[PDB]
Paper text:
Endolysins are produced by many double stranded DNA bacteriophages to effect the release of new virions from an infected cell by degrading the bacterial cell wall. Endolysins typically consist of a peptidoglycan hydrolase domain and a C-terminal domain that is often termed as a cell wall binding domain. Here, we present the crystal structures of autoproteolytic fragments of the CD27L and CTP1L endolysins, covering the C-terminal domain. We propose that the cleavage and oligomerization are linked, and they provide the endolysin with a trigger and release mechanism that leads to activation.
When crystallization trials for full length CD27L endolysin were set up, crystals appeared overnight from freshly purified protein. The structure was used as a model to solve the structure of the full-length CD27L crystals by molecular replacement. It was found that the “full length” construct had been proteolyzed and the crystal contained six copies of the C-terminal portion of CD27L alone. The refined structure shows clear electron density for all six monomers of the C-terminal domain with a Matthews coefficient of 2.3, and there is no space in the crystal lattice for an additional N-terminal domain. The C-terminal portion of CD27L consists of a platform of four parallel beta strands, flanked by an alpha helix with two additional alpha helices mounted on top. The autolytic fragment of the C-terminal domain starts at the end of the linker at methionine M186, which is still integrated in the C-terminal domain. The proteolytic fragments of CD27L form a mixture of dimers within the crystal lattice. All six molecules are engaged in one common dimerization mode, where the alpha helices α1 and α3 from one molecule stack on their symmetry mate from a second molecule. The dimerization is such that the N-termini of both monomers are pointing away from the dimer interface, and we term this dimerization mode a ‘head-on’ dimer. An alternative dimerization mode is found among the six C-terminal domains present in the crystal structure of the proteolytic fragment of CD27L endolysin, between two molecules that are each involved in separate head-on dimers as well.
Author numbering:
A (entry chain F), B (entry chain A): 186 to 270
């Protein structure tokens, strides 16, 4: 169903998650809160921000890439770095 | 009356406008689409993105600061720079 799914927890980390999705235009992408994440329907899973990174392993067995800093700003810079922007 | 109002045009410049809002916790803040902007109820006006920056002068006669780059990423970095992050 999706090529890239980017998960976050909360309206702050949503920003960073959204910017990670700005790095991809090669397929269908889903940006969604961890509380709405449905496992098993994505090729790639990216988890953004500390909150989502602590909860994700209890929600899915899929492999994933973590994008996380110490605060909302650091996370945002790491997101930008991850997509080479 | 709002201490800070941040205006944007569209869901992409919304993201940078949200980031500018992360820089302010000293007062009441409105983040809103340029279509919904109501002049005369803010101490500080900040206009995010090329879209809003072209429409705003025909909507209000208030002074404002422009936060805009050539693409969405440039706009986002300028948002971060505007709040010293």
């Amino acid at each position: 169903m999706y090529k890239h799914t980017i998960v976050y927890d909360g309206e702050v980390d949503k920003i960073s998650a959204t910017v990670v999705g700005w790095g991809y235009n090669d397929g269908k992408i889903l940006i969604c809160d961890i509380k709405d994440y449905v496992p098993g329907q994505t090729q790639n899973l990216y988890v953004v921000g500390g909150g989502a990174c602590e909860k994700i392993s209890s929600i899915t067995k899929e492999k994933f890439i973590m994008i996380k800093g110490n605060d909302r700003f650091d996370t945002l810079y790491k997101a930008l770095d991850f997509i080479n922007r």
